[PDB]
C-alpha cells in the first residue's frame, strides 16, 4: 500500500488504541491481510485417468443414444445457411461435430452458430462431449479415437 | 381541507422552536397569531411567518375563509447540522453543532 511507515501517534500517554502503521489491514484504506497473488489453478490428470474418463463418457453417450455416426459430414460451400439446412435435415440443433480431417468450409460455416461446435478428432474434450446434446462422429474419427484410446 | 406551509432549514434549534410550536397546537389562528405577536422568542417570528404563509396559501390556493381555519398539526423536525470548529485551550478543538430545523404548519378547517 502506498504510505509511510510512521506511527500515527505515540505508543502510550494518549487515550487511543495502540497503532504502528496506517497501512494496517484494520484501517480504512489499509492492506489486505492475506492479499492474493496470481496463482495457477491447473491440476494434474493422469493419462490413464483421462482416457478412462473419455472411454466412460463415450460409453455413456452410446447408452444414452447421444452419439451419431456417419461416413462423411461435409458442406460444399462455406455457408452457415447450408450447414443449418443440413442439421435441420438431421434434426439437430445442439451438436458437436468431430471430423478426422481439416474442413475449412465446415469450420467457417459452423463458426457463427453457438449451438454447433466443430472439432478435429484430436481436439476433443470431455466437457464438450457432455455439454453438447448430440455428438456426430465421422467413421474415420471413430477409427482415430479408437486408435488413440486403444 | 388541510393546507401546508414549511420553513425548511430554519436556522434555529428544534428544541428551541418546539417550545413555541407547542403553544399554538389546536388553536384558532387569530389566537395563535396574537400569542406569537406577544411571545418574545425568535422562533415565534419564524413560526409566525410560516403560519401567515399557510394562511395565505389556504386562502389563495385552496379557497378557505380565515375565521374558520385552525392549527391542526404543527411539528418541528431536525435539519442538517452545519458544523464548525471552535478552538479551546491547550490546542484542543471542539466541533460545535449549528442546528437547523424544518418547521411545518398544517392549518385547516377540519
Amino acid at each position: 500500500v502506498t504510505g509511510s511507515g510512521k506511527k500515527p501517534w505515540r505508543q502510550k500517554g494518549t487515550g487511543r488504541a495502540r497503532s504502528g502503521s496506517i497501512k494496517s489491514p484494520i484501517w480504512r484504506s489499509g492492506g489486505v491481510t492475506f492479499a492474493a497473488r496470481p496463482q495457477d489453478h491447473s491440476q494434474k490428470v493422469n493419462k490413464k485417468m483421462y482416457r478412462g474418463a473419455l472411454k466412460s463418457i463415450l460409453s455413456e453417450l452410446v447408452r444414452q443414444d447421444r452419439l451419431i455416426v456417419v461416413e462423411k459430414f461435409s458442406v460444399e460451400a462455406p455457408k452457415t445457411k447450408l450447414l443449418a439446412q443440413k442439421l435441420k435435415d438431421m434434426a439437430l440443433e445442439d451438436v458437436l461435430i468431430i471430423t478426422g480431417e481439416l474442413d475449412e468450409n465446415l469450420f467457417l460455416a459452423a463458426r457463427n452458430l453457438h449451438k454447433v461446435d466443430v472439432r478435429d478428432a484430436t481436439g476433443i474434450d470431455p466437457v464438450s462431449l457432455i455439454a453438447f446434446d448430440k455428438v456426430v462422429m465421422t467413421a474415420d474419427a471413430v477409427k482415430q479415437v479408437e486408435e488413440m484410446l486403444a | 381541507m388541510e393546507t401546508i406551509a414549511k420553513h425548511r432549514h430554519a436556522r434555529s434549534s428544534a428544541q428551541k422552536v418546539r417550545l413555541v410550536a407547542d403553544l399554538i397546537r389546536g388553536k384558532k389562528v387569530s389566537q395563535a397569531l396574537d400569542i406569537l405577536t406577544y411571545t418574545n422568542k425568535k422562533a415565534a417570528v419564524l413560526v409566525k411567518k410560516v403560519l401567515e404563509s399557510a394562511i395565505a396559501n389556504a386562502e389563495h390556493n385552496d379557497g378557505a375563509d380565515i375565521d374558520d381555519l385552525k392549527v391542526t398539526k404543527i411539528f418541528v423536525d431536525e435539519g442538517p447540522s452545519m458544523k464548525r470548529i471552535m478552538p479551546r485551550a491547550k490546542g484542543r478543538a471542539d466541533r460545535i453543532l449549528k442546528r437547523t430545523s424544518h418547521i411545518t404548519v398544517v392549518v385547516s378547517d377540519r
Binding site: 505515540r10 500517554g13 | 464548525r84 491547550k90 490546542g91 478543538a93
Partner: peptide, 27 residues
C-alpha cells in the same frame, strides 16, 4: 467548510501536558 483539523492527530494529547499531579506518594 474546509473544516478539518478536528481530531486529526488529536494534538490535544500530543500536548501531553505534564501529568503526575505531584502524586509520587504512590511509591
Amino acid at each position: 467548510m474546509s473544516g478539518k483539523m478536528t481530531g486529526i492527530v488529536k494534538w490535544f494529547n500530543a500536548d501531553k501536558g505534564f501529568g503526575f499531579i505531584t502524586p509520587d506518594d504512590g511509591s
